[PDB]
Design a protein around this motif. Structure first.
Motif, PDB file in Angstrom:
ATOM      1  N   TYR A   1      24.058 -15.735  -6.088  1.00  0.00           N
ATOM      2  CA  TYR A   1      24.101 -14.264  -6.090  1.00  0.00           C
ATOM      3  C   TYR A   1      24.153 -13.712  -7.537  1.00  0.00           C
ATOM      4  O   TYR A   1      23.361 -12.846  -7.881  1.00  0.00           O
ATOM      5  CB  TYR A   1      25.319 -13.771  -5.270  1.00  0.00           C
TER       6      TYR A   1
ATOM      7  N   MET B   1      42.466  -8.514  -4.982  1.00  0.00           N
ATOM      8  CA  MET B   1      41.834  -7.201  -4.698  1.00  0.00           C
ATOM      9  C   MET B   1      42.933  -6.306  -4.109  1.00  0.00           C
ATOM     10  O   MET B   1      43.524  -6.664  -3.079  1.00  0.00           O
ATOM     11  CB  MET B   1      40.606  -7.409  -3.784  1.00  0.00           C
TER      12      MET B   1
ATOM     13  N   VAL C   1      33.902 -10.049   2.271  1.00  0.00           N
ATOM     14  CA  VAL C   1      33.065  -9.337   1.300  1.00  0.00           C
ATOM     15  C   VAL C   1      31.689 -10.063   1.272  1.00  0.00           C
ATOM     16  O   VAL C   1      31.625 -11.269   1.033  1.00  0.00           O
ATOM     17  CB  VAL C   1      33.696  -9.313  -0.104  1.00  0.00           C
TER      18      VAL C   1
ATOM     19  N   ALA D   1      33.145 -16.670 -14.565  1.00  0.00           N
ATOM     20  CA  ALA D   1      33.372 -15.766 -13.443  1.00  0.00           C
ATOM     21  C   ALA D   1      33.525 -16.538 -12.165  1.00  0.00           C
ATOM     22  O   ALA D   1      34.294 -16.159 -11.260  1.00  0.00           O
ATOM     23  CB  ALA D   1      32.285 -14.745 -13.288  1.00  0.00           C
TER      24      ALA D   1
ATOM     25  N   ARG E   1      32.202  -4.673   2.749  1.00  0.00           N
ATOM     26  CA  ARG E   1      33.569  -5.130   2.876  1.00  0.00           C
ATOM     27  C   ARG E   1      34.016  -4.762   4.300  1.00  0.00           C
ATOM     28  O   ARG E   1      33.884  -3.601   4.743  1.00  0.00           O
ATOM     29  CB  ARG E   1      34.445  -4.490   1.833  1.00  0.00           C
TER      30      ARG E   1
ATOM     31  N   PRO F   1      40.272 -13.766  -7.667  1.00  0.00           N
ATOM     32  CA  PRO F   1      40.846 -12.440  -7.847  1.00  0.00           C
ATOM     33  C   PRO F   1      41.799 -12.039  -6.748  1.00  0.00           C
ATOM     34  O   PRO F   1      41.738 -12.475  -5.627  1.00  0.00           O
ATOM     35  CB  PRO F   1      39.624 -11.517  -7.826  1.00  0.00           C
TER      36      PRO F   1
HETATM   37  O1  LIG Z   1      34.533  -6.709  -4.008  1.00  0.00           O
HETATM   38  C1  LIG Z   1      34.238  -7.760  -4.540  1.00  0.00           C
HETATM   39  C2  LIG Z   1      34.955  -8.976  -4.291  1.00  0.00           C
HETATM   40  C3  LIG Z   1      34.440 -10.204  -4.756  1.00  0.00           C
HETATM   41  O2  LIG Z   1      35.107 -11.312  -4.669  1.00  0.00           O
HETATM   42  C4  LIG Z   1      33.335 -10.085  -5.749  1.00  0.00           C
HETATM   43  C5  LIG Z   1      33.256  -8.813  -6.372  1.00  0.00           C
HETATM   44  C6  LIG Z   1      32.049  -8.747  -7.322  1.00  0.00           C
HETATM   45  C7  LIG Z   1      31.981  -9.460  -8.505  1.00  0.00           C
HETATM   46  C8  LIG Z   1      30.694  -9.593  -9.167  1.00  0.00           C
HETATM   47  C9  LIG Z   1      29.442  -9.038  -8.873  1.00  0.00           C
HETATM   48  C10 LIG Z   1      28.297  -9.347  -9.661  1.00  0.00           C
HETATM   49  C11 LIG Z   1      28.516 -10.215 -10.751  1.00  0.00           C
HETATM   50  C12 LIG Z   1      29.764 -10.803 -11.110  1.00  0.00           C
HETATM   51  C13 LIG Z   1      30.864 -10.438 -10.285  1.00  0.00           C
HETATM   52  C14 LIG Z   1      32.217 -10.838 -10.324  1.00  0.00           C
HETATM   53  C15 LIG Z   1      32.786 -11.724 -11.154  1.00  0.00           C
HETATM   54  C16 LIG Z   1      34.159 -12.019 -11.028  1.00  0.00           C
HETATM   55  C17 LIG Z   1      34.944 -11.465  -9.980  1.00  0.00           C
HETATM   56  C18 LIG Z   1      34.333 -10.562  -9.047  1.00  0.00           C
HETATM   57  C19 LIG Z   1      32.977 -10.233  -9.232  1.00  0.00           C
HETATM   58  O3  LIG Z   1      33.227  -7.737  -5.446  1.00  0.00           O
END
Ligand SMILES: O=C1C=C(O)C[C@@H](C=C2c3ccccc3-c3ccccc32)O1
Length: 134
Positions: free
Chosen positions: A22, A43, A118, A36, A109, A41
Motif C-alpha cells: 500500500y 489511535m 482500517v 513506518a 474505518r 500506533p
Molecule cells: O488510520 C490509519 C491507521 C493505520 O494504521 C494507518 C494509517 C495511515 C498511515 C499511512 C498512510 C500512507 C503512508 C504511510 C502511513 C503511515 C505510516 C505510519 C503509521 C500510520 C500510517 O491510517
C-alpha cells in the motif's frame, strides 16, 4: 449519544497486512516504508460536538486531525504528504478520501466485533490494519 460513539477511545494496532505494498502504491520511499512499517500506533479518537479528532501516536510519527464530516480540510500524513481530505460517514463506516498531486487514496474505518478495522486502498492495492482497545 451520537454519531461515532462506537469509534471513540484509545486503540492499539494488533495486526497489519499488505501495508508495505500500500505504501509503495502511495509513493512512499524505501527508508520511510521500512521505518513506518515497524510502527505499532496508538489511535485516539474523540468527539466534541460536531468535531471528530483522530490522533495517531507512534515511535515513527505523531499525527492529529480534527474535522467535521463532509467538510474538506488540510492534512499532514504520517509519510509527510500534504493532502486535501474529506471524511464522511457511509452506513456506519468512516470514509476518508485524501487528494494530492492528482492522486487519491481512501481509508475506511469501521467497528467489527471488539476491533476497529482500517482498510487503506490505493488503486488495486488494499492494506488491512486491525486495532483493539488499548
Ligand atoms: O488510520 C490509519 C491507521 C493505520 O494504521 C494507518 C494509517 C495511515 C498511515 C499511512 C498512510 C500512507 C503512508 C504511510 C502511513 C503511515 C505510516 C505510519 C503509521 C500510520 C500510517 O491510517
Amino acid at each position: 449519544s451520537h454519531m461515532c460513539d462506537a469509534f471513540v477511545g484509545t486503540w492499539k494496532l494488533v495486526s497489519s497486512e499488505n501495508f508495505d505494498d500500500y505504501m509503495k502504491e502511495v509513493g512512499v520511499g524505501f527508508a520511510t516504508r521500512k521505518v513506518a512499517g515497524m510502527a505499532k500506533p496508538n489511535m485516539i479518537i474523540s468527539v466534541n460536538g460536531d468535531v471528530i479528532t483522530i490522533k495517531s501516536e507512534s515511535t515513527f510519527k505523531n499525527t492529529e486531525i480534527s474535522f467535521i464530516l463532509g467538510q474538506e480540510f488540510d492534512e499532514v500524513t504520517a509519510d509527510d504528504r500534504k493532502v486535501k481530505s474529506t471524511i464522511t460517514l457511509d452506513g456506519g463506516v468512516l470514509v476518508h478520501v485524501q487528494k494530492w498531486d492528482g492522486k487519491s487514496t481512501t481509508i475506511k474505518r469501521k467497528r467489527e466485533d471488539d476491533k476497529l478495522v482500517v482498510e487503506c486502498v490505493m488503486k488495486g492495492v488494499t492494506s488491512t490494519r486491525v486495532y483493539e482497545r488499548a
